[PDB]
Scaffold this active site. Structure first.
Site, PDB file in Angstrom:
ATOM      1  N   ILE B 168       0.025   7.201  15.357  1.00 54.86           N
ATOM      2  CA  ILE B 168      -0.128   7.545  13.915  1.00 54.86           C
ATOM      3  C   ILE B 168      -0.487   9.021  13.894  1.00 54.86           C
ATOM      4  CG2 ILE B 168      -1.334   7.281  11.762  1.00 54.86           C
ATOM      5  CD1 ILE B 168      -1.848   4.383  12.466  1.00 54.86           C
ATOM      6  N   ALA B 169       0.239   9.833  13.175  1.00 53.73           N
ATOM      7  CA  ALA B 169      -0.100  11.209  12.767  1.00 53.73           C
ATOM      8  C   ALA B 169       0.402  11.399  11.349  1.00 53.73           C
ATOM      9  CB  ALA B 169       0.574  12.253  13.679  1.00 53.73           C
ATOM     10  N   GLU B 279      -9.314  13.813   4.042  1.00 55.74           N
ATOM     11  CA  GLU B 279      -9.367  13.396   5.434  1.00 55.74           C
ATOM     12  C   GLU B 279     -10.554  12.459   5.760  1.00 55.74           C
ATOM     13  OE1 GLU B 279      -9.541  17.263   7.458  1.00 55.74           O
ATOM     14  OE2 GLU B 279      -7.335  17.727   7.095  1.00 55.74           O
TER      15      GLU B 279
END
Ligand code: 4LU
Ligand code: 4LU
Ligand code: 4M4
Ligand code: 4M4
Ligand code: 4M4
Ligand code: 4M4
Ligand code: K
Ligand code: K
Ligand code: K
Ligand code: K
Ligand code: MN
Ligand code: MN
EC number: 4.1.1.102
Lengths: 496, 496
Positions: B168-169, B279
């Site tokens: 996952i990015a 984030e």
């Protein structure tokens, strides 16, 4: 008499608040009373009143546990503390602390002497009592004695008569007519004791009053300034002169409605074994007995059906957290402001075991100071860690205006995300340390020095141009109209 | 197909678990879907399935929010994660992490190629799709793009064919046929990208698969070792070979039951604007756009009635906490043990915003090592902070056997009471730092270096002769028979 001025009325208040459990069957002061109270404090349950204590006689005594502990609901979490102060039971911590600070810019209201009171209803002279025969509790299984004194007020006066101090310091039964306890720097009972020792002529006249006016036990637990007589501070805070009666065997004055009063002397020469004790940080070190101060008891006076308050202290949450930590934080806030530091709020997070204080900064004022983190941290730490009000506190966390310091989750978030370990911190090794924290007295370094830190959780732009982020949360990451729509449709959609 | 092997079955599982809210009325992918999901994650509510997304067409797409977030009850708190792994919904974090580590001492089970699957039910060639026309969500109001990719799996392969990585990015829409995203060291997508760049001949063949087998997205989120093909690790973990189908436009292989598949290339030369993004640490810095990696999309394939999973990440608690933090902690535990360190358990406290890891020490083994705090802290920090599994973690807290590292309250208690600031800590300034933590990338020091610390919350005797305290709590400060009596009489006496 009002609840905040009379401990017997305070107990009534807790009943009325549905915040009391009366236990009328026999309960053992050897561990059982304290175990029940411990469980209360770990679960935020109702305060226990033990009306049938095994070993109660000459009318001495019932026990109230958890007098200053937390209630379960958020809306009245601090209600027991509010009831010490005539505040509504929904009072916030900010309102409690503001009430406790209010007297700091008022003239004292000195106490009023009255000829008698409820605390004179019964007496026992030195041929009639034996402290080892009373139902004094064993509070933790490894304690080094039966800790009679966990929520009473020691009363000592300077040799010159100009300062009378009221404070809580622990003490345990030594023998039939003596206690041992902690009398340690920089505490005011110690400071006064040193005055007497230097004069060298006599032991310190002393009294210890249990079940005092609730407003008085709160000031007893707060580090108000050196030389300030607590009775006059509490008078100002409450707007009324406290009623005191003279001891029988000395010329000290005790609250008229005190439940139980011990009169005697604090030795300037003698010591005896003291501790160990299960303490505020959550620990006991079995076998760690050391020499403590020694008290001689000459006389006991007490109310009919006397009640002894007790703190069964240790892991969260009890009087040692709610009172020691919060009241030190209050005094620190004032101290900072008096030193021209732009601090709006202070609180000792319970999650830190009340070893941290979070300091909320007015960052508009900070920006006008045109300073840096290194400079500001040093300034704050020099003011706080060189003062008695900072004694118990080993970490200061500086946070900006968005953080509510009375919410531990938010302080933890800011600390973990805004303070770079090392670089954004200043260590203080040449300050007085608090030895009761395990990593001090039982740690790798000097028990009485150092181990303190200022952790700066202000972000860089808070010193310069202003906050440059928004939180990634529901509150800050969505427009108002959307938020309100979501809330309004929440349960329609199927959520809780 | 089982829930852990098929995302469509996983959604069914959540329904059956009464852990899903289906919303069949129109919901806007511009902020509204993500706002609802954010509120879910802040309250541990049921996962939202948005079946009627404004702008859904060519059959693309529905959204599932909060796929890996927490449930409200303690008994099944981690149930959504358990459902990724065929575990009971009451599984503990220790059992989840043990399942995720289990394949590390098993032979890989390589995947099986099958000729077709549900992910081939529909296609759009490069004349038929436009990424700007799809209902890609705006997740936070200040985001620099519409983040299509928050819970899919990027698939890239080394030039020599010997390692295929799944991870996952994040990535966001750039234009009708391109994405931009983070491709940063030391991540495996970066490592592979550097191999291609050094060869210098072509862009990286790539696929991005959304709604993959739940067991696969968990390994995608874990830092298993360099050179290990996630498909074979997940095969071993699950005891079955995963079924994969070849992409249409390249020779990579994607899970047969993937909801949505993008095929294309990751450029070795081109970049484009990326971010900012709300984030994992709880922040967005509006306007902080930087050049990121650029992806070209050539083809989309997808299931009938495709569902896109989405993480609305930020403040506690979401996939970035439950998966990034816990899975890094798991890998750290193994790393430590493989380096002959006596670590039994590791966890990233959510209270630390998953920036700390608590390491539980077998103190019998520690005592046999006849070492000191200074030495042991240095050893631990050199192993962990010099390894990719330690990348995201800035503070390690060493605790003894009495502390349950999966309980943040207990880790906080031990840290605050057993680790003397400065003296019991070792700072690490010459290690790779995690720039996304605000105090790194937006802080006072280098964004990519230092800011790490090992905090030793072992007490001195834990290195020598053994623990020398008892807790001042109900559990440890009262004998067993008394405790049981208290518990048995609790509600009789009048407590809750
Ligand atoms: C509420 C509270 C405060 C305790 C306390 C407790 C409670 C319940 C106990 C009794 C359960 C156990 C021990 N405590 C001690 C104590 N201060 C101290 O020097 N020795 C103590 O042994 N304090 C803190 C002391 O009351 C505050 O630091 C005051 O500021 C002292 O008043 P002063 O400023 O006038 O010296
Ligand atoms: C669960 C999860 C993991 C994210 C993540 C997210 C989630 C939901 C997001 C999508 C909401 C936002 C961003 N994340 C990134 C990320 N790693 C990374 O390098 N860049 C990212 O942008 N990760 C962490 C990355 O998956 C782990 O570090 C893996 O160990 C990477 O796999 P690798 O070891 O094979 O490189
Ligand atoms: C319940 C509150 C309350 C407050 C003050 C009082 O004096 C009191 O007496 C019973 C009760
Ligand atoms: C022993 C407890 C204790 C609590 C608070 C204090 O400020 C203190 O000063 C010596 C001691
Ligand atoms: C509720 C659990 C559960 C577990 C696995 C499944 O494949 C499933 O299909 C509906 C449900
Ligand atoms: C951007 C997020 C992120 C998350 C976890 C990682 O290990 C990481 O490495 C570069 C990046
Ligand atoms: K005081
Ligand atoms: K900072
Ligand atoms: K991975
Ligand atoms: K330590
Ligand atoms: Mn004082
Ligand atoms: Mn990998």
């Amino acid at each position: 008499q009002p609840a905040h001025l009379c401990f017997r009325s305070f107990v009534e208040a807790l009943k009325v608040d549905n915040d009391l459990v009366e236990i009328n069957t026999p309960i053992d002061p050897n561990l059982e009373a304290a175990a029940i109270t411990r469980r209360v404090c770990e679960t935020n349950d109702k305060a226990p009143l033990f009306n049938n204590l095994i070993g109660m006689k000459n009318g001495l005594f019932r026990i109230l546990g958890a007098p200053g502990s937390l209630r379960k609901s958020s809306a009245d979490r601090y209600g027991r503390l509010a009831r010490h102060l005539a505040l509504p039971p929904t009072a916030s911590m900010r309102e409690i602390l503001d009430k406790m600070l209010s007297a700091s810019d008022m003239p004292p209201i000195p106490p009023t002497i009255v000829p008698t009171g409820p605390c004179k209803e019964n007496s026992l002279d030195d041929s009639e009592f034996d402290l080892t025969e009373l139902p004094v509790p064993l509070i933790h299984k490894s304690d080094g004695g039966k800790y009679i004194q966990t929520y009473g007020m020691h009363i000592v006066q300077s040799p010159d008569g100009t300062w009378t101090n009221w404070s809580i310091a622990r003490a345990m039964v030594h023998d039939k007519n003596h206690l041992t306890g902690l009398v340690i720097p920089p505490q005011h009972i110690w400071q006064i004791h040193q005055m007497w020792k230097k004069e060298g002529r006599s032991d310190v006249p002393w009294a210890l009053a249990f079940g005092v006016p609730p407003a008085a036990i709160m000031a007893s637990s707060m580090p108000i300034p050196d030389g300030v007589t607590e009775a006059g501070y509490v008078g100002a805070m409450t707007g009324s002169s406290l009623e005191l009666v003279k001891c029988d065997t000395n010329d000290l004055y005790v609250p008229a409605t005190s439940e139980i009063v011990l009169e005697g002397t604090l030795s300037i020469s003698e010591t005896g074994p003291e501790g160990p004790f299960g303490e505020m940080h959550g620990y006991i070190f079995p076998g760690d007995t050391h020499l403590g101060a020694k008290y001689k008891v000459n006389r006991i006076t007490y109310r009919n059906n006397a009640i002894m308050p007790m703190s069964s202290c240790g892991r969260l949450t009890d009087e040692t957290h709610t009172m020691i930590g919060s009241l030190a934080a209050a005094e620190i806030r004032k101290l900072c402001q008096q030193n021209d530091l732009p601090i709006t709020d202070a609180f000792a997070p319970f999650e830190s075991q009340v070893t941290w204080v979070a300091l909320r900064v007015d960052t508009e004022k900070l920006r006008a100071m045109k300073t840096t983190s290194e400079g500001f941290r040093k300034r704050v730490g020099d003011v706080v860690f060189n003062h008695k009000a900072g004694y118990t506190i080993h970490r200061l966390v500086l946070v900006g205006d968005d953080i509510d310091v009375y919410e531990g989750k938010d302080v933890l978030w800011a600390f973990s995300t805004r303070c770079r370990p090392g670089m954004d911190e200043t260590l203080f090794e040449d300050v007085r340390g608090f030895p009761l924290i395990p990593y001090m007295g039982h740690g790798n370094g000097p028990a009485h020095r150092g181990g303190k830190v200022v952790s700066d959780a202000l972000m860089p732009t808070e010193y310069t141009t202003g906050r440059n982020w928004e939180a990634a949360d529901f509150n800050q990451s969505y427009p108002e109209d959307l938020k309100q729509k979501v809330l309004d449709n929440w349960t329609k959609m199927g959520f809780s």
